Amino acid sequence: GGMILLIDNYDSFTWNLYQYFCELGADVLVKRNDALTLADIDALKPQKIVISPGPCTPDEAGISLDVIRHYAGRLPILGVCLGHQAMAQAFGGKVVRAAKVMHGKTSPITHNGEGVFRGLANPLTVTRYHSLVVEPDSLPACFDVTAWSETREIMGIRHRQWDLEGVQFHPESILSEQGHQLLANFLHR
Amino acid sequence: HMKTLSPAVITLLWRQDAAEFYFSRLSHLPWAMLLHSGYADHPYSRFDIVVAEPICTLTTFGKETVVSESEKRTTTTDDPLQVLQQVLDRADIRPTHNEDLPFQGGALGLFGYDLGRRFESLPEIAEQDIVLPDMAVGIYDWALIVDHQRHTVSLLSHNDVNARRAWLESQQFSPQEDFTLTSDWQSNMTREQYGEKFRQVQEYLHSGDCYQVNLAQRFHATYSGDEWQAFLQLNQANRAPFSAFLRLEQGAILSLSPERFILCDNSEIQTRPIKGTLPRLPDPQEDSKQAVKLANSAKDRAENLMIVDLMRNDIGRVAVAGSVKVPELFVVEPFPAVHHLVSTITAQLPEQLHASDLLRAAFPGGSITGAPKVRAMEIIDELEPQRRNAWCGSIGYLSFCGNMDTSITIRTLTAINGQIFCSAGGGIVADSQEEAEYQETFDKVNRILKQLEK
Ligand SMILES: N[C@@H](Cc1c[nH]c2ccccc12)C(=O)O
Ligand SMILES: [Cl-]
Ligand SMILES: [Cl-]
Ligand SMILES: [Cl-]
Ligand SMILES: [Cl-]
Ligand SMILES: [Mg+2]
Ligand SMILES: [Zn+2]
């Protein structure tokens, strides 16, 4: 029995994520990255937090980084695309150009059946809208990689101790398989 | 409000052509409007709607809406769809839904593409060379409904349906001088100039500004004679289920649109984005093959799903809770000129919203702008020489009962002070190819353009 806070980082498909979560029975509060402070979050008392995709860098994602630093190990956090990159960067990871431009291409990803991939089919076909990946050689030791592209780019990370996980792709997208079961893992873990 | 009672209905004599027969005599009256299902065999081709003689009109040019009643005329800078909803509410006609009578009176007319500039801040690079409203909507307290499923012709009115029957039967039809084109068709761009714009768009897709852009060209010719005779012959040939003839104060809109923008039927929302087209082929064996090539083309399925993701988001902003579903993907719909790839998104309108609020959230269509929508529109304004005006807007109705249906005004001509305009576009992705997409525009309107050449 808990509200989910979706931090909107001004993506074009933010309501697709809100609707997917609503389809799964979740009470979602949508607040924008510049419309919330960490103190405001404490009083809203969320049970879980999702950092939405966005066109900006983690630095320009308002309170996104601030939220990860403060709530890591206190509340479950999911990061999607930008939210995933912000998650990596907050622990000392770097973001880099992808291999090629990935504008609504789908791609098969292999995974280890851990975190949000618990119970899901392997491989999984998913869509990427954005052209930046987490740098593997830089990835902090506190994260396992949960999924890889055909190219061995990072498509998911999970913290080894705390409930906080990131996916590079768009599960909310109709082009992406088992988006519902993926987000249901996060919701009901 | 004051009138919750259902409108009085009179059934007239069934004939398949009832709408063209009754509308002939009204075709010359400003604010006379026909929505025609093109006589199409199509799951969304059932109703022809005829209105005229509105109790109230709304005209939007730029930041001003003029609302004209009998003698009263007001001007306002307010949101045009908020003004429209206020006028509907102020009419104090509130009937229950009737599945057989989807428009029970209310608003009907044109929402032009450049009405979108009232909902988003956009650059002003493209040249405004057609003076015709961004919104031209009449309020009607009556209608004539032709139902091709029940084979019924219904005349409804919230005033005196008997007087309206007589008023209608009393009007008579002196066929006007026949339509002729008095010049050849001429594009607003050379094939060279298309390229320069096609390359500039792909340059913008590589930067990852946007993922998709509908790039359009416009053909113009001079004409003389009655636009209604042109429409009768185009309507026959195009069999398009979202066809319309609007007589405006400034000119006529001849819509042969096959595309539905948004339907709101007893709070059940539906949108059917067209994205993906292959031309139709002479040999009936080779043409059945095109329908499978189109359905099974990975490039074309990708482009479509991008637009489904866009429409899911536009509708999802305002839809109820977890109501946004995608019940059907990549159905191929054959039309005389072209096969089209059509996907359908459904949702529920919350009781706190109106169909007008739904229309504001989604307008203009993702299917004819691109993704992200605002950047696609920025680029379109930057590269297309002239504003789109009535083309790639919407024609449709907002019933007093709460229902709505709208088109996208593709395959739509504007006829104004002796000039006739026809536009054709096509979705551009990084993968797509200059000559294919240039030729795609021609394939979309050639039968239209050539049918009018004599
Ligand atoms: N085809 C629609 C009615 C319709 C015809 N042409 C239109 C143009 C715009 C909006 C609706 C329409 C139906 O059966 O209900
Ligand atoms: Cl198209
Ligand atoms: Cl299939
Ligand atoms: Cl579904
Ligand atoms: Cl077109
Ligand atoms: Mg195409
Ligand atoms: Zn992304």
XYZ file of C-alpha atoms and ligand atoms in Angstrom:
664
model
C 0.000 0.000 0.000
C 2.236 2.822 -1.279
C 2.312 5.765 -3.714
C 4.966 5.719 -6.494
C 6.666 9.059 -7.311
C 7.474 9.468 -11.050
C 10.012 12.304 -11.488
C 9.252 13.733 -14.964
C 12.489 14.728 -16.783
C 10.416 16.195 -19.713
C 10.442 13.088 -22.003
C 8.077 12.836 -25.034
C 6.610 9.497 -23.735
C 6.297 10.193 -19.964
C 2.501 9.493 -19.889
C 3.134 6.050 -21.524
C 5.084 5.136 -18.316
C 2.363 6.660 -16.038
C -0.344 4.703 -17.916
C 1.630 1.376 -17.796
C 2.028 1.854 -13.997
C -1.712 2.761 -13.746
C -2.593 -0.423 -15.753
C -0.652 -2.375 -13.046
C -2.825 -0.773 -10.285
C -0.186 1.699 -8.972
C -1.049 5.059 -7.322
C 1.444 7.330 -9.211
C 2.232 10.973 -8.365
C 3.881 12.721 -11.363
C 6.075 15.725 -10.421
C 8.583 17.509 -12.723
C 12.347 17.688 -11.910
C 12.238 21.474 -11.092
C 8.855 21.322 -9.301
C 10.074 19.209 -6.343
C 12.672 19.500 -3.528
C 14.108 16.572 -1.467
C 12.252 17.975 1.588
C 8.945 17.924 -0.371
C 9.540 14.183 -1.145
C 10.025 13.418 2.586
C 6.503 14.807 3.345
C 4.819 13.035 0.343
C 6.269 9.766 1.869
C 6.549 7.678 -1.360
C 7.006 3.863 -1.155
C 9.013 3.788 -4.430
C 10.530 6.319 -6.886
C 10.971 6.181 -10.706
C 13.315 8.588 -12.586
C 11.755 9.077 -16.068
C 13.619 9.326 -19.379
C 14.532 12.807 -20.680
C 16.535 14.635 -23.403
C 18.949 16.356 -20.870
C 22.088 15.127 -18.927
C 21.820 13.790 -15.326
C 23.343 17.181 -14.200
C 20.481 19.099 -15.992
C 17.793 16.634 -14.649
C 16.773 18.926 -11.724
C 16.631 16.900 -8.474
C 17.171 13.435 -10.180
C 20.832 13.045 -8.928
C 19.869 14.650 -5.558
C 17.055 11.978 -5.172
C 19.413 8.998 -5.881
C 22.071 10.270 -3.350
C 19.463 10.873 -0.591
C 17.026 7.885 -1.112
C 19.551 5.117 -2.139
C 19.194 2.371 0.541
C 15.984 4.002 2.015
C 13.443 3.447 -0.882
C 13.381 1.343 -4.063
C 14.384 3.440 -7.154
C 14.023 2.556 -10.856
C 15.775 4.629 -13.555
C 14.746 4.540 -17.242
C 17.131 5.810 -19.957
C 18.216 9.182 -18.347
C 17.216 7.827 -14.890
C 19.554 4.819 -15.519
C 22.484 7.099 -16.608
C 21.845 9.418 -13.549
C 21.912 6.300 -11.342
C 25.338 5.211 -12.751
C 26.824 8.760 -12.621
C 25.718 9.304 -8.953
C 28.045 6.365 -7.935
C 30.913 7.572 -10.224
C 30.024 6.038 -13.622
C 30.434 7.949 -16.933
C 27.941 8.325 -19.858
C 29.265 8.071 -23.510
C 28.054 8.129 -27.194
C 26.445 4.759 -28.207
C 27.847 2.683 -31.169
C 25.201 4.107 -33.618
C 22.089 6.441 -33.394
C 19.186 4.346 -31.903
C 16.015 6.351 -32.881
C 13.047 3.953 -32.321
C 14.994 0.874 -33.500
C 14.231 -2.360 -31.556
C 17.109 -4.745 -30.628
C 17.446 -8.082 -28.750
C 19.107 -7.903 -25.295
C 20.333 -10.880 -23.216
C 19.899 -10.759 -19.416
C 20.595 -12.853 -16.258
C 16.948 -13.045 -14.976
C 17.824 -10.752 -12.032
C 15.957 -7.715 -10.645
C 13.278 -6.430 -13.077
C 14.198 -9.343 -15.447
C 13.145 -11.931 -12.717
C 10.758 -14.355 -14.559
C 11.071 -12.609 -17.986
C 11.918 -14.229 -21.357
C 15.577 -14.350 -22.562
C 16.314 -12.871 -25.002
C 13.996 -9.787 -24.822
C 13.287 -7.359 -27.755
C 13.318 -3.719 -26.508
C 13.322 -0.205 -28.097
C 15.936 2.506 -27.510
C 15.026 6.145 -28.353
C 18.429 7.634 -27.154
C 22.131 7.438 -28.275
C 24.091 7.428 -24.949
C 25.182 4.367 -22.875
C 26.884 3.853 -19.480
C 30.672 3.299 -20.068
C 31.404 -0.326 -18.987
C 35.083 0.144 -17.938
C 33.980 3.091 -15.644
C 30.963 1.224 -14.089
C 31.294 1.274 -10.253
C 31.790 -2.144 -8.511
C 28.484 -1.722 -6.522
C 26.497 -2.391 -9.798
C 26.096 -5.679 -11.713
C 25.142 -5.355 -15.386
C 21.689 -7.089 -15.673
C 21.488 -6.990 -19.536
C 23.615 -6.394 -22.689
C 22.897 -5.318 -26.307
C 24.138 -7.475 -29.270
C 27.097 -4.956 -29.217
C 27.874 -5.546 -25.449
C 26.552 -2.058 -24.440
C 24.986 -1.859 -20.925
C 21.149 -2.141 -21.084
C 20.562 -2.669 -17.304
C 22.379 -2.276 -13.913
C 21.302 -3.334 -10.384
C 22.956 -2.208 -7.102
C 24.453 -5.261 -5.305
C 23.177 -4.209 -1.820
C 20.234 -1.720 -2.245
C 16.935 -1.959 -4.193
C 17.861 0.354 -7.038
C 17.942 -0.612 -10.706
C 18.279 1.090 -14.128
C 17.286 0.109 -17.728
C 18.709 1.981 -20.806
C 15.710 1.107 -23.088
C 11.955 2.056 -22.969
C 9.776 -0.682 -21.380
C 6.699 1.652 -21.565
C 7.007 1.497 -25.414
C 4.664 -0.845 -27.390
C 7.765 -1.941 -29.469
C 9.316 -3.415 -26.209
C 8.403 -6.957 -24.912
C 6.952 -7.714 -21.394
C 7.179 -3.970 -20.402
C 4.223 -4.705 -18.040
C 5.899 -7.690 -16.259
C 9.251 -5.745 -16.045
C 7.558 -2.777 -14.241
C 5.412 -5.231 -12.157
C 8.710 -6.746 -10.828
C 9.794 -3.229 -9.704
C 6.275 -2.518 -8.279
C 5.845 -5.775 -6.260
C 9.512 -6.964 -5.673
C -29.258 22.719 -18.546
C -32.694 23.830 -19.876
C -33.156 21.050 -22.537
C -32.276 17.448 -21.450
C -35.098 16.115 -23.710
C -34.031 14.205 -26.868
C -34.452 15.969 -30.246
C -37.616 15.278 -32.313
C -36.790 12.902 -35.224
C -38.604 12.425 -38.593
C -37.590 9.465 -40.840
C -37.392 10.391 -44.558
C -37.358 8.095 -47.593
C -34.306 5.756 -47.727
C -32.013 6.180 -50.811
C -28.194 5.447 -50.745
C -27.556 8.986 -52.208
C -29.800 10.851 -49.679
C -26.923 13.089 -48.420
C -25.667 14.217 -51.916
C -29.374 14.635 -53.018
C -30.366 16.927 -50.050
C -26.952 18.717 -49.885
C -26.924 19.730 -53.617
C -29.563 22.406 -52.792
C -27.480 23.783 -49.797
C -23.952 23.482 -51.339
C -23.793 27.284 -52.120
C -24.782 28.514 -48.579
C -21.876 29.586 -46.302
C -21.953 27.312 -43.159
C -23.545 24.429 -45.166
C -21.534 21.317 -44.255
C -21.539 17.662 -45.376
C -19.583 14.833 -43.707
C -19.746 11.892 -46.162
C -18.522 8.268 -45.607
C -17.683 8.139 -49.381
C -20.092 5.139 -49.900
C -17.047 3.085 -48.653
C -17.170 -0.579 -47.551
C -15.159 0.120 -44.336
C -15.766 -0.650 -40.616
C -15.857 3.167 -39.984
C -18.113 4.106 -42.979
C -21.752 4.264 -41.733
C -22.942 7.908 -41.468
C -23.298 10.944 -43.765
C -24.124 14.190 -41.833
C -25.717 17.357 -43.367
C -26.042 20.722 -41.552
C -26.711 24.340 -42.634
C -28.098 27.600 -41.185
C -26.179 27.614 -37.855
C -27.607 29.445 -34.777
C -24.015 30.561 -33.990
C -20.590 30.596 -35.755
C -16.959 30.753 -34.583
C -14.154 32.111 -36.828
C -10.509 32.065 -35.600
C -7.808 34.093 -37.399
C -4.565 34.083 -35.366
C -5.154 35.264 -31.762
C -8.815 36.429 -32.291
C -12.015 34.296 -32.256
C -15.217 36.072 -33.485
C -18.409 34.432 -32.102
C -21.432 35.565 -34.144
C -25.031 34.909 -32.969
C -28.162 36.433 -34.580
C -27.169 40.132 -33.969
C -24.533 39.788 -31.199
C -20.869 39.610 -32.299
C -18.033 39.167 -29.739
C -14.224 38.994 -30.232
C -11.944 37.116 -27.769
C -8.217 36.159 -27.485
C -9.116 33.109 -25.268
C -8.288 29.460 -26.209
C -10.482 28.723 -29.263
C -11.576 25.232 -27.972
C -12.460 26.756 -24.549
C -14.566 29.386 -26.414
C -16.183 26.575 -28.467
C -16.975 24.544 -25.307
C -18.502 27.692 -23.645
C -20.736 28.270 -26.740
C -21.901 24.571 -26.743
C -22.668 24.826 -22.962
C -24.434 28.234 -23.411
C -26.827 26.676 -26.040
C -28.429 24.798 -23.033
C -29.110 21.671 -25.199
C -27.991 18.514 -23.261
C -29.449 15.259 -24.728
C -28.368 11.665 -23.764
C -26.158 9.637 -26.187
C -27.939 7.727 -29.016
C -25.754 5.054 -30.752
C -27.970 5.583 -33.885
C -27.632 9.439 -33.835
C -23.985 10.187 -32.937
C -24.314 13.954 -33.781
C -27.493 15.319 -32.145
C -26.700 18.899 -33.088
C -23.708 20.853 -31.764
C -20.490 22.117 -33.412
C -19.318 21.038 -36.893
C -16.544 22.341 -39.178
C -12.815 22.892 -39.667
C -9.889 23.065 -37.229
C -6.986 24.135 -39.493
C -3.382 22.924 -38.915
C -2.208 26.437 -37.900
C -4.769 26.387 -35.009
C -2.003 24.274 -33.341
C 0.028 27.532 -32.930
C -2.586 28.438 -30.235
C -1.523 25.393 -28.102
C 2.288 25.482 -28.664
C 4.772 28.386 -29.142
C 6.191 27.925 -32.714
C 8.431 29.907 -35.131
C 6.799 32.025 -37.932
C 9.182 31.273 -40.885
C 6.620 29.682 -43.316
C 4.641 32.163 -45.453
C 0.919 32.692 -44.651
C -0.418 33.029 -48.265
C -3.991 31.577 -47.797
C -6.514 33.733 -45.824
C -8.958 31.091 -44.515
C -9.718 30.570 -40.783
C -7.680 28.356 -38.381
C -11.131 27.494 -36.925
C -14.442 27.725 -38.870
C -17.177 25.976 -36.838
C -20.990 26.404 -36.940
C -23.355 25.480 -34.054
C -26.393 23.579 -35.425
C -29.635 22.838 -33.500
C -30.631 20.295 -36.225
C -29.045 17.771 -38.628
C -29.809 15.274 -41.381
C -28.242 11.826 -40.587
C -27.949 9.087 -43.270
C -27.253 5.702 -41.594
C -25.995 3.139 -44.228
C -26.043 0.323 -41.596
C -29.770 0.661 -40.615
C -30.688 2.127 -44.090
C -32.386 5.093 -42.279
C -32.506 8.857 -43.076
C -33.201 10.827 -39.846
C -34.000 14.572 -39.619
C -33.539 15.753 -36.027
C -34.139 19.231 -34.554
C -34.237 20.716 -31.021
C -36.589 23.497 -32.353
C -39.347 22.492 -34.894
C -38.373 19.409 -36.921
C -41.546 19.834 -39.090
C -40.619 23.417 -40.188
C -37.034 22.137 -40.880
C -38.416 19.229 -43.025
C -40.456 21.818 -45.036
C -37.527 24.335 -45.159
C -35.379 21.489 -46.563
C -37.979 20.126 -49.088
C -38.785 23.769 -50.233
C -35.093 24.483 -51.211
C -34.505 23.508 -54.923
C -31.363 22.725 -57.003
C -30.438 24.757 -60.156
C -27.190 22.897 -61.116
C -24.439 25.599 -61.311
C -21.884 25.996 -64.198
C -19.572 22.908 -64.245
C -16.083 22.874 -62.611
C -13.060 23.317 -64.979
C -9.337 23.782 -64.145
C -8.077 26.914 -66.030
C -4.296 26.111 -65.607
C -1.990 23.053 -65.158
C -1.047 21.874 -61.625
C 2.250 23.459 -60.411
C 4.141 22.499 -57.177
C 5.470 25.072 -54.650
C 8.881 23.266 -55.073
C 11.186 21.880 -57.801
C 12.411 18.242 -57.412
C 15.828 19.900 -56.564
C 14.176 22.011 -53.777
C 12.455 18.851 -52.368
C 15.940 17.220 -52.068
C 17.502 20.273 -50.298
C 14.627 19.983 -47.728
C 14.687 16.107 -47.602
C 18.480 16.203 -46.877
C 18.051 19.040 -44.286
C 15.408 16.834 -42.492
C 17.665 13.709 -42.408
C 20.547 15.966 -41.154
C 18.107 16.800 -38.246
C 17.256 13.071 -37.614
C 21.016 12.168 -37.338
C 21.466 14.935 -34.647
C 18.545 13.079 -32.927
C 16.543 16.372 -32.698
C 13.566 14.220 -33.811
C 12.835 10.643 -35.072
C 10.117 11.303 -37.758
C 9.014 14.335 -39.907
C 6.020 14.472 -42.339
C 7.387 16.697 -45.200
C 4.679 17.933 -47.656
C 4.548 19.784 -51.010
C 1.543 21.757 -52.368
C 0.106 21.828 -55.919
C -1.920 24.880 -57.122
C -4.108 25.497 -60.216
C -6.693 28.180 -61.138
C -10.314 26.951 -61.512
C -13.784 28.315 -62.476
C -17.285 26.742 -62.047
C -19.000 25.056 -59.010
C -16.771 23.173 -56.496
C -19.798 20.935 -55.571
C -19.744 19.225 -59.062
C -15.976 18.551 -58.584
C -16.712 17.025 -55.136
C -19.545 14.728 -56.451
C -17.134 13.150 -59.011
C -14.104 13.024 -56.558
C -16.331 11.513 -53.776
C -17.437 8.740 -56.239
C -13.797 7.918 -57.248
C -12.134 8.120 -53.729
C -14.554 5.928 -51.635
C -12.883 7.612 -48.550
C -14.747 7.221 -45.197
C -13.846 10.698 -43.679
C -14.849 12.755 -46.755
C -16.427 16.225 -46.286
C -17.604 19.280 -48.214
C -17.512 22.541 -46.177
C -18.937 25.782 -47.690
C -17.191 28.562 -45.700
C -17.554 32.377 -46.003
C -14.039 32.438 -47.647
C -14.263 29.342 -49.923
C -14.817 25.544 -49.941
C -12.974 22.560 -48.377
C -13.213 19.316 -50.435
C -11.918 16.538 -48.083
C -11.448 12.979 -49.481
C -9.699 11.916 -46.217
C -9.490 8.191 -45.447
C -8.070 8.951 -41.929
C -9.935 9.309 -38.593
C -8.149 11.556 -36.040
C -10.162 11.050 -32.790
C -13.567 9.475 -32.138
C -15.225 9.971 -28.712
C -18.327 7.674 -28.655
C -20.121 7.438 -25.255
C -16.714 8.303 -23.605
C -14.847 5.555 -25.564
C -11.901 7.141 -27.392
C -10.402 5.733 -30.623
C -7.629 7.084 -32.905
C -6.484 5.329 -36.128
C -3.117 6.797 -37.170
C -2.182 6.075 -40.806
C 1.587 5.686 -41.163
C 2.873 3.513 -44.050
C 1.676 3.608 -47.693
C 2.435 1.576 -50.893
C 0.829 2.511 -54.279
C -1.826 0.190 -55.815
C -0.745 -1.980 -58.789
C -2.765 -2.827 -61.959
C -2.486 -6.722 -61.862
C -4.817 -8.070 -59.101
C -2.221 -10.832 -58.311
C 0.628 -8.286 -57.788
C -1.667 -5.938 -55.756
C -2.609 -8.616 -53.149
C 1.216 -8.968 -52.769
C 1.594 -5.201 -52.001
C -0.885 -5.608 -49.074
C 1.453 -8.288 -47.540
C 4.742 -6.404 -48.382
C 3.265 -3.342 -46.573
C 1.934 -5.324 -43.526
C 5.305 -7.172 -43.180
C 7.765 -4.271 -43.880
C 9.972 -3.843 -40.742
C 10.929 -0.186 -41.669
C 7.183 0.630 -42.106
C 6.050 -1.251 -38.896
C 8.781 0.675 -36.915
C 7.655 4.136 -38.232
C 3.958 3.229 -37.457
C 4.771 2.103 -33.852
C 6.707 5.367 -33.240
C 3.448 7.198 -34.175
C 1.417 4.758 -31.962
C 3.798 5.628 -29.044
C 3.240 9.360 -29.805
C -0.611 8.974 -29.932
C -0.586 6.777 -26.772
C 1.180 9.699 -24.990
C -1.065 12.530 -26.371
C -4.224 10.480 -25.351
C -2.569 9.162 -22.114
C -2.102 12.745 -20.746
C -5.942 13.029 -20.501
C -7.263 9.380 -20.687
C -8.754 7.605 -17.579
C -6.265 5.672 -15.294
C -5.161 2.521 -17.203
C -7.645 2.748 -20.139
C -5.074 3.300 -22.950
C -5.025 0.034 -24.985
C -3.741 -0.745 -28.545
C -6.315 -3.339 -29.702
C -5.184 -3.608 -33.416
C -1.815 -2.957 -35.235
C -0.751 -2.621 -38.931
C -4.157 -3.441 -40.533
C -3.747 -2.693 -44.321
C -6.605 -0.621 -45.813
C -6.859 -0.510 -49.616
C -7.955 2.824 -51.266
C -8.154 3.526 -55.058
C -4.688 5.221 -55.206
C -2.854 3.537 -52.251
C -2.721 0.787 -49.551
C -2.408 2.297 -46.011
C -0.999 0.816 -42.751
C -3.425 1.746 -39.902
C -3.066 1.080 -36.141
C -5.801 1.806 -33.535
C -5.419 3.156 -29.963
C -8.390 3.195 -27.546
C -8.921 4.863 -24.145
C -11.664 6.304 -21.882
C -12.506 10.019 -21.502
C -12.807 10.995 -17.821
C -16.240 12.442 -16.847
C -14.440 15.725 -15.810
C -13.206 16.373 -19.436
C -14.933 17.174 -22.738
C -14.131 15.866 -26.234
C -12.903 19.490 -26.881
C -10.245 19.001 -24.101
C -9.202 15.695 -25.765
C -8.924 17.484 -29.162
C -6.780 20.340 -27.644
C -4.358 17.808 -26.021
C -3.785 15.859 -29.309
C -4.026 18.522 -32.098
C -2.642 18.522 -34.695
C -2.154 14.763 -35.345
C 1.178 12.983 -34.678
C 0.529 11.053 -37.974
C 1.045 14.286 -40.040
C 3.623 16.199 -37.900
C 6.269 13.797 -36.427
C 8.087 12.808 -33.175
C 8.788 14.659 -30.931
C 5.713 16.644 -32.143
C 6.932 20.204 -31.245
C 10.376 19.738 -32.951
C 8.738 18.135 -36.060
C 6.408 21.215 -36.295
C 9.407 23.636 -35.768
C 11.165 21.922 -38.764
C 7.971 21.784 -40.962
C 7.516 25.588 -40.405
C 11.244 26.069 -41.211
C 11.293 24.055 -44.499
C 7.744 24.087 -46.038
C 7.466 27.379 -48.035
C 3.802 28.073 -47.012
C 1.639 27.344 -43.912
C -0.546 24.197 -44.239
C -3.812 26.051 -43.306
C -6.842 23.660 -43.736
C -4.543 20.804 -44.937
C -3.511 18.233 -42.207
C -5.964 19.849 -39.809
C -9.263 18.167 -38.834
C -12.897 18.342 -39.964
C -15.442 16.910 -37.514
C -18.252 17.475 -34.992
C -18.743 17.922 -31.219
C -22.360 16.763 -30.509
C -24.390 18.421 -27.696
C -24.562 14.846 -26.226
C -20.726 14.904 -25.634
C -19.716 12.735 -28.652
C -17.057 13.774 -31.186
C -15.506 12.437 -34.412
C -12.775 14.138 -36.494
C -10.616 13.427 -39.565
C -7.096 14.394 -40.580
C -7.499 16.624 -43.673
C -5.079 14.674 -45.926
C -6.323 14.249 -49.559
C -8.090 17.604 -48.984
C -8.362 20.554 -51.437
C -8.881 24.242 -50.545
C -10.800 26.241 -53.221
C -10.539 30.030 -52.649
C -11.121 33.036 -54.992
C -10.342 31.017 -58.157
C -7.235 29.161 -56.790
C -7.376 25.436 -55.790
C -4.671 23.840 -53.560
C -3.833 20.135 -52.978
C -1.010 18.977 -50.617
C 0.830 15.631 -50.242
C 3.429 14.575 -47.643
C 5.148 11.434 -46.344
C 6.941 10.359 -43.145
C 10.779 10.713 -43.360
C 13.117 8.510 -41.181
C 16.979 8.248 -41.370
C 16.480 4.914 -43.298
C 14.054 6.331 -45.981
C 15.257 7.388 -49.511
C 14.823 10.798 -51.353
C 13.286 9.639 -54.732
C 10.930 7.000 -53.165
C 9.485 9.669 -50.753
C 9.259 12.397 -53.488
C 7.390 9.909 -55.740
C 5.274 8.774 -52.682
C 3.688 12.304 -52.520
C 2.652 12.064 -56.238
C 1.193 8.525 -55.761
C -1.071 9.890 -52.943
C -2.902 12.633 -54.951
C -2.282 11.774 -58.668
C -5.817 10.345 -59.212
C -7.293 13.466 -57.476
C -5.062 15.888 -59.510
C -5.638 14.099 -62.877
C -9.436 13.590 -62.376
C -9.741 17.450 -62.227
C -7.365 18.037 -65.263
C -10.530 17.107 -67.220
N -17.419 8.013 -41.387
C -18.025 8.597 -40.108
C -18.742 9.924 -40.368
C -17.928 10.859 -41.196
C -17.887 10.914 -42.555
N -16.996 11.874 -42.957
C -16.449 12.470 -41.855
C -15.509 13.494 -41.761
C -15.096 13.867 -40.505
C -15.619 13.265 -39.364
C -16.546 12.246 -39.458
C -16.983 11.834 -40.722
C -18.999 7.621 -39.462
O -19.441 6.657 -40.050
O -19.358 7.837 -38.333
Cl 2.614 8.015 -44.757
Cl 2.494 -11.065 -37.487
Cl -4.669 -4.269 -25.722
Cl -0.777 12.909 -47.916
Mg 6.332 6.111 -45.574
Zn 16.008 6.595 -24.063
